[PDB]
Design an enzyme around this catalytic site. Structure first.
Site, mmCIF file in Angstrom:
data_model
loop_
_atom_site.group_PDB
_atom_site.id
_atom_site.type_symbol
_atom_site.label_atom_id
_atom_site.label_comp_id
_atom_site.label_asym_id
_atom_site.label_seq_id
_atom_site.Cartn_x
_atom_site.Cartn_y
_atom_site.Cartn_z
ATOM 1 C CD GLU A 158 38.104 30.004 38.061
ATOM 2 O OE1 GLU A 158 39.237 29.743 37.582
ATOM 3 O OE2 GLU A 158 37.245 30.697 37.462
ATOM 4 C CG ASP B 245 32.324 39.697 44.355
ATOM 5 O OD1 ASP B 245 31.480 40.611 44.249
ATOM 6 O OD2 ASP B 245 33.360 39.637 43.665
#
Ligand SMILES: CC1(C)CN2C(CS/C(=N\C3CCCCC3)NC3CCCCC3)=CSC2=N1
Ligand SMILES: CC1(C)CN2C(CS/C(=N\C3CCCCC3)NC3CCCCC3)=CSC2=N1
Ligand SMILES: CCCCCCCC/C=C\CCCCCCCC(=O)OC[C@H](O)CO
Ligand SMILES: CCCCCCCC/C=C\CCCCCCCC(=O)OC[C@H](O)CO
Ligand SMILES: CCCCCCCC/C=C\CCCCCCCC(=O)OC[C@H](O)CO
Ligand SMILES: CCCCCCCC/C=C\CCCCCCCC(=O)OC[C@H](O)CO
Ligand SMILES: CCCCCCCC/C=C\CCCCCCCC(=O)OC[C@H](O)CO
Ligand SMILES: CCCCCCCC/C=C\CCCCCCCC(=O)O
Ligand SMILES: CCCCCCCC/C=C\CCCCCCCC(=O)O
Ligand SMILES: CCCCCCCC/C=C\CCCCCCCC(=O)O
Ligand SMILES: CCCCCCCC/C=C\CCCCCCCC(=O)O
Ligand SMILES: CCCCCCCC/C=C\CCCCCCCC(=O)O
Ligand SMILES: CCCCCCCC/C=C\CCCCCCCC(=O)O
EC number: 3.2.1.17
Lengths: 456, 466
Positions: A214, A223
């Site tokens: 991850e 993001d």
């Protein structure tokens, strides 16, 4: 107080021990030499060193018939072989253990500095072994060469080391204990002390797994769709403000972060997630039964998938999960490689499936399967090496106690010490068989019983 | 029967004198080191860090010399406890200092041999391993002295010494002193310097560092103006718009979810693969093939660098220049290479590359080698002098060894003469304690002032003769 060789036991027991090692030693070592040496080209570093070991052991072992004859009857073989077998003894004690020291250096390099380990490991095993092990081992035999001689004595010829006085006995015993066991022991243990410490900065197996799969962020990240993440895939809350996200981290960490955290704190934050993740699995009726049947390593595998795909998605893998619960690892590995998960994220999915398949951590790491077996082979070899020698060490220690007046007992006590030193040393030469024995049954499967010769 | 008689005429006079001198000059010298570095210093070299540990070793031992002097001249007035303590401190010093020297040599070995990455390991040795591997073992190995050092009444006085069960204990412990004291640290030091002088001329830089300088090092993924994604040392990843697709290629190769960031360590791995691809292509290119085979490590680095800059087709085209490199006539090949388009366009980089082809050393990619060579010179002087001090004493002990082992057979007189010269030489050997301070003497000074320079401002035109 005189020396007293015993017929009933040493005159019979020792030549037998000598002969068995001789026999099993030529065959075993001779096989390692020809099998890798002649025929097989691509060589592993540990195998390179084990070739050296087996050369050192076949050389010593071919001289054992002399020991056996010497013990039963006499030294018929003259002065020159007298020095020769002594030299060959010293060469063996020193080269064997230092080659082991070099196997441990190599493991240290492999594990501790794996980034550019090849240039040096290769250099060690092809150039430095001759200058660090073989040549010194031979130079150090000059003493055996000088003082080993044959004398006439009490109706037989003794081949032994003979010196100007009793102080010489202490000088060479001290050197043998130093070059043989203390200095190589320091190096072996030091290397393993550095290995275990390198392996202590890493966290749990499940943490290093998901860090790789991850990713690990030490600073908060907005993001492209407006969500906030940190540590190992940890989602802060609904706010659209860096400040209010920083407010959330601070709460879960218990400290004014200002957006940066440590690895250790990321592992703690990850542990809480792993926990919350595992809770929902035990609330899901499709997933809980599988999780109950899995070993820890494979449960890490399934948690990984939950970390990636959410609990619901993972819960849709109805037929792959069912093969996993049934311990049908290969089928399940095969089936999972056909899914949209695999086709979309193969790098990740490939490692996870290899975890399910084997129940090991081999997929992570470089050459993990090979590195795992290499670490285990090395430790087995060395521990067993010292285990063979240990009763001799205790014997020699007790004799040392006699000489240094640490204990005072009669001659009957001293002469029993010396017969057990002859015994434990003979038993020690089994070290020459370990390297071959550890190569036995490679690729064998132990699945055939008397019934399986009669049935399927 | 031979008896031990203590000598006076010279020895109750000579030893205290030498002890007192080493005592006084050593306290001043080492104490200065300890105060001037220990505290004020802020930019300190590794060698200096070690020479602080050294001066701490030496001060601890020097402060106990007054006891040696009074012992030699009069008595042991100081009781059983101090008798043990001065031994412990003696043994601590013999072990710690020689081993500090050995660590100064391991440090030098890292500084010169592995300058791709020395800093972490040298920092580790100087601040952590020096304790656990020098000081602590030194302390543990004194347990014998603590146990066997005791005060005895002999010839009208008290004698402080190590007293054992028998003469075999004398042998066991002397051999340990020679081993730990000399032969193990000696081996380490000489092995380090064997590796150094064998590699001194081809050191200063790796092929990683060379290209890290020519091409730059990228820990983060960078998209250039023509859409190409690159990482580390010029490692091309993908040339299509998704950045995430670039990440996925980086992840496949590195083997982990990078998020477009890699360590300096992973960058060298990507590079070592790239280097093994370019070598593989060179060995299949008939124009580059036989020239590569004829070249040393450094000069091969110089070819692979060119191939990374302008690709294999390009380097296959320097036809005359390559034959010159193949013939091993470096200067004309280096004259010729400087006449190409490549040189006019990228002169700095190609200047460096040609310097490597010409001389075969990393001089163009390396230095601050004027300070590094001063560092090497200091360490060699410190160490050689240390052994020089100790050498007459090793000769004495070797003579004593010959007596006990019956390598020679002389009478009592001869043994007595050896006994007294071992006391002499050990005493003289303690000047080892003043070397470290002396070597720091006069830094910055210039020796230019004669009596005439004090009577006048010099002789005319000194600047002509500087
Ligand atoms: C350490 C050592 C190499 C030294 N040694 C010794 C001492 S020599 C020796 N014979 C041999 C030892 C091995 C080399 C050849 C001589 N003695 C006796 C003589 C009476 C009969 C039994 C052995 C015995 S076993 C042993 N191992
Ligand atoms: C190796 C060693 C530490 C051991 N030793 C020795 C042997 S003890 C010793 N007194 C001292 C040695 C130094 C520490 C305190 C005891 N002897 C004599 C006694 C008669 C007069 C001269 C010294 C002398 S100098 C030396 N150096
Ligand atoms: C830490 C390192 C030290 C650990 C102890 C190791 C060795 C001590 C040796 C003990 C010696 C045993 C003597 C045997 C004995 O009991 O004899 C005495 C007496 O004669 C009987 O009545
Ligand atoms: C007891 C020693 C005899 C048993 C050792 C068997 C021989 C063996 O395993 O040799 C195979 C070879 O080393 C494959 O590389
Ligand atoms: C002692 C002098 C300086 C060290 C001071 C530190 C104290 C060390 C203890 C001194 C000691 O044990 O002295 C024994 C004897 O009584 C003495 O005449
Ligand atoms: C091998 C040479 C044999 C003679 C060795 C003489 C003794 C060595 C010794 O104990 O030296 C002190 C050491 O140099 C303190 O740092
Ligand atoms: C490899 C290394 C070579 C091995 C060393 C050889 C023999 C050690 C025993 C020799 C004993 C030497 C006696 C010297 C001694 O103790 O005398 C000094 C002084 O007189 C006391 O204060
Ligand atoms: C009578 C004296 C007997 C002493 C013999 C000494 C032999 C030492 C010489 C060479 C050691 C053997 C080297 C083994 C190399 C094979 C391993 C490999 O190539 O990987
Ligand atoms: C359990 C039975 C053990 C018997 C001991 C085995 C000994 C085998 C090893 C070596 C045998 C060497 C024979 C010596 C020959 C000398 C005899 C002679 O010439 O008189
Ligand atoms: C510690 C006390 C005694 C040590 C015994 C001597 C060591 C024998 C060396 C044999 C070997 O390991 O190769
Ligand atoms: C791993 C296996 C270890 C083999 C057993 C070693 C015990 C040594 C006892 C002896 O040989 O005297
Ligand atoms: C770090 C572990 C500490 C143990 C230290 C061991 C060092 C060995 C010490 C003394 C060995 C001296 C040899 C004794 C004489 C025996 C000779 C004989 O048996 O014939
Ligand atoms: C330092 C020299 C001191 C001498 C100690 C006293 C002499 C004595 O009293 O005999």
């Amino acid at each position: 107080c005189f020396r007293e060789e015993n017929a009933n036991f040493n005159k019979i027991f020792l030549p037998t021990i000598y002969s068995i090692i001789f026999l099993t030693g030529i065959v075993g070592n001779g096989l390692v030499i020809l099998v890798m040496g002649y025929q097989k080209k691509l060589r592993s570093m540990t195998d390179k060193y084990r070739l050296h070991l087996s050369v050192a052991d076949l050389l010593f072992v071919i001289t054992l018939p002399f020991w056996a004859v010497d013990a039963v009857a006499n030294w018929y073989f003259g002065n020159f072989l007298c020095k020769a077998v002594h030299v060959i003894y010293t060469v063996n004690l020193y080269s064997s253990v230092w080659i082991l020291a070099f196997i441990s250096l190599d493991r240290y390099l492999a594990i501790v500095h794996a980034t550019n380990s090849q240039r040096p490991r290769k250099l060690l095993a092809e150039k430095v072994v001759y200058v660090g092990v073989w040549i010194p081992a031979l130079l150090l035999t000059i003493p055996d060469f000088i003082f080993a001689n044959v004398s006439e004595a009490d109706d037989r010829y003794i081949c032994d080391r003979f010196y100007p006085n009793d102080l010489w006995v202490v000088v060479f015993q001290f050197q043998h204990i130093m070059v043989g066991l203390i200095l190589p022991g320091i190096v072996i243990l030091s290397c393993y002390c550095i290995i275990i410490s390198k392996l202590s900065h890493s966290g749990s197996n499940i943490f290093e797994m998901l860090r790789i799969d991850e990713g690990l962020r030490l600073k908060i990240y907005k993001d492209t769709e407006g969500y906030y993440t940190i540590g190992i895939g940890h989602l802060l809350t609904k706010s659209p403000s860096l400040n209010a996200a920083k407010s959330e981290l601070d709460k879960a960490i218990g400290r004014n972060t200002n957006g940066v955290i440590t690895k250790d704190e990321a592992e703690k934050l990850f542990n809480q997630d792993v926990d919350a993740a595992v809770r929902g699995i035990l609330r899901n009726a499709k997933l809980k039964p599988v999780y109950d049947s899995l070993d820890a390593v494979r449960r890490a595998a399934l948690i990984n998938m939950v970390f990636q795909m959410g609990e619901t998605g993972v819960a849709g893998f109805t037929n792959s999960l069912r093969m996993l619960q049934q311990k049908r690892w290969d089928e399940a590995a095969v089936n999972l490689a056909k899914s949209r998960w695999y086709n979309q994220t193969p790098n990740r999915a490939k490692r996870v499936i290899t975890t399910f398949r084997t129940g090991t951590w081999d997929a992570y790491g470089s050459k993990g399967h090979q590195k795992r077996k290499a670490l285990k082979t090395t430790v087995i070899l060395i521990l067993a090496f010292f285990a063979c020698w240990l009763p001799y060490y205790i014997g020699i220690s007790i004799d040392s106690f006699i000489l240094l007046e640490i204990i005072k007992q009669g001659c009957e006590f001293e002469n029993t010490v010396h017969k057990w030193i002859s015994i434990t040393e003979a038993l020690a030469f089994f070290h020459c068989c370990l390297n071959p024995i550890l190569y036995a049954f490679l690729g064998a499967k132990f699945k055939t019983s008397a019934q399986h010769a009669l049935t399927s």
